[PDB]
């Protein structure tokens with residue numbers, strides 16, 4: 001049995017921690033909703 | 040149940056203790072999450088029940104109490120924020136410049152941030168605080184790191 005609990009408001013935070021790169025990838029999406037890399 | 044707009048954890052007591060299986064967004068009276076989080080099951084909010092209303096396994100999305108309401112889109116140029124809600128941890132904003140998933144059916148923004156599987160359904164926002172998609176359906180690239188699509192539904 002699943003239940004939900006509030007965790008916060010949805011707002012942009014000024015000066016949030018900035019990280020992560022920006023990869024450009026060729027991908028395929030199957031009928032089951034799974035993404036895979038095309039090489 | 041609680042109907043206030045915002046981000047919510049999706050919990051289960053079926054396993055050991057209380058386990059966070061995902062996250063979702065309450066907006067305009069509708070609860071939005073990824074299909075793989077709930078598998079389309081009903082949800083509880085206090086003494087109230089939320090029934091599924093729309094879902095699609097291929098998009099990996101589901102809405103409860105009404106139709107999908109989120110329609111903002113990444114502009115293809117600006118940094119966005121993942122409002123990560125990890126299991127047992129406080130909601131935290133992480134800013135990043137999305138990459139791209141290129142597919143035979145068009146390109147989708149993607150965020151290269153790695154969080155526990157229970158963070159699936161966390162919202163990705165633009166600078167106006169609008170939800171441009173949900174985090175948690177993606178791929179594991181060569182170096183073993185996780186890249187999530189920015190998955191957005193259609194507002195009918």
Ligand SMILES: c1cnc2c(c1)NCCC2
Pocket residue numbers: 153154155156157158159174175176185
């Ligand atoms: C963050 C969100 N979803 C997932 C992961 C991480 N890792 C594995 C596949 C699903």
